[PDB]
Amino acid sequence: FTVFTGGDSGAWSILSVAPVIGESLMAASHLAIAPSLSTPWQLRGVASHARYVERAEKIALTSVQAGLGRNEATRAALIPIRKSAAWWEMTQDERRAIFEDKSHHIAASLKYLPAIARQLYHCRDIGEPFDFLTWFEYAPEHATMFEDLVGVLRATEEWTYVEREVDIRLARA
Ligand code: HEM
């Protein structure tokens, strides 16, 4: 379990919290991130195994992607997301087709690496009010590229299934 806590301390100060769809989150000054085996808000998720990635895609990703904790990557984003019942009712082949064949989530995002490093956390199965916690780190000079990527994905068929989403932006403290 990785716990994201909006509060008065932590490795990240919070630049901004803005609504995207559905209910937003309360303001806080800092974000702490920490492992755990079990305040304005607190959110938890789990880094997990691949649900959609195929081998050729994994190869393509690992060849360009960067890791967390880069000295220059002093800006970050946390985007909590919940998809609709209609999404979760669909079968695996139908979700994969929307995710990649129609939305090209992977193929269209590859150009943004290595600039944008990412980590995905899953939390539907632990009863959290979101389904995913998406975490991104980048240099200040790539922030406009980052907001551009985000706007691109938010225009996709995949995103028509998002029913709650919040925009949190951070600066390394
Ligand atoms: C920076 C470039 C990005 C790349 C290379 C990328 C790549 C991926 C990959 C390969 C997966 C699937 C993991 C799996 O097989 O389970 C994924 C899942 C996901 N990504 Fe992205 N992503 C990027 C940016 C973003 C952004 C900016 C967001 C949110 C605004 C986002 C939201 C998500 C979500 C919610 C999932 C889970 C999809 C699901 O399982 O229903 N990604 N991403």
Range of the domain at 80: 1-173
152 among annotated binding-site residues: no
For the chain, the domain total comes to 1
Q: Which atom of ligand 1 is nearest to the CA of 106?
A: 7
Structure resolution, Å: 2.1
Residues 6+ apart with CB under 8 A from 62: none
96 among annotated binding-site residues: no
The CATH number of whichever domain residue 92 belongs to comes to 3.30.70.3420
| Residue 51: φ, ψ to 5° | -100, -25
Give the mutation target among 120, 136, 159, 161 for probing the ligand 1 site: most ligand atoms within 8 A of CB: 120
Experimental method: X-ray
Residues 6+ apart with CB under 8 A from 132: 45, 80, 81, 82, 120, 121, 122, 123, 124
Which residues on neighbouring strands pair with residue 21, listed in sequence order?
165
Which residues on neighbouring strands pair with residue 2, listed in sequence order?
35, 45
CB 96 within 8 A of CB 52: yes
